[PDB]
């Protein structure tokens, strides 16, 4: 059903990476904010790139769920999620 998520945060010129092992959209957001030393409310944009190489924005559990489904279909082992904190 769900699989490991590789969190890649593009922030302050760095590429910060952690893994997170069900998985909810909110937990991913909290993990990114903790990793980047961000305020609880720091707006984020999360995207996963699909089989056609399109970045697909996920801003909900439903979208995360669809990325998981499509990741299982592809027999992938980790779901890569790219994350872009907003720049004030």
């Amino acid at each position: 059903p769900h699989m490991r998520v590789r969190l890649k945060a593009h922030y302050g010129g760095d590429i910060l990476i952690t893994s997170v092992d069900t998985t909810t959209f909110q937990d991913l957001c909290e993990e990114v904010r903790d990793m980047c030393g961000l305020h609880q409310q720091h707006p984020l944009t999360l995207k996963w790139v699909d089989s056609e190489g399109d970045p697909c924005t996920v801003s909900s559990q439903m979208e995360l769920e669809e990325a998981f489904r499509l990741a299982c279909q592809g027999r992938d082992e980790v779901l890569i999620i790219h994350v872009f904190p907003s720049i004030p």
Partner: protein, 82 residues
């Protein structure tokens, strides 16, 4: 029932979801709930014909019309903002 929704010239935001109280109404409500910048009545749905051309659908009719035209195993949607 696999949907890939392109918000539009080129693609500006892409959102993917599953989808099986009208069909067209349920789908447009799915699209309105999933795209933050979208609110109901504020957008136009489209699909692509085999020739490539964009074409607006706006009813259950034009919706099954659109579906026949989608053979990928993936239903593609193209949204313009009014």
């Amino acid at each position: 029932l696999t949907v890939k929704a392109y918000l539009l010239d080129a693609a500006r935001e892409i959102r993917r979801f599953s989808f099986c109280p009208g069909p067209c109404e349920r789908l447009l409500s799915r699209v309105a709930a999933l795209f933050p910048a979208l609110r109901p009545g504020g957008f136009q749905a489209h699909y692509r014909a085999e020739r490539g051309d964009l074409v607006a659908f706006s009813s259950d009719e034009e919706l099954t019309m659109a579906m026949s035209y989608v053979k990928d195993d993936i239903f593609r949607i193209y949204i313009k903002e009014k």
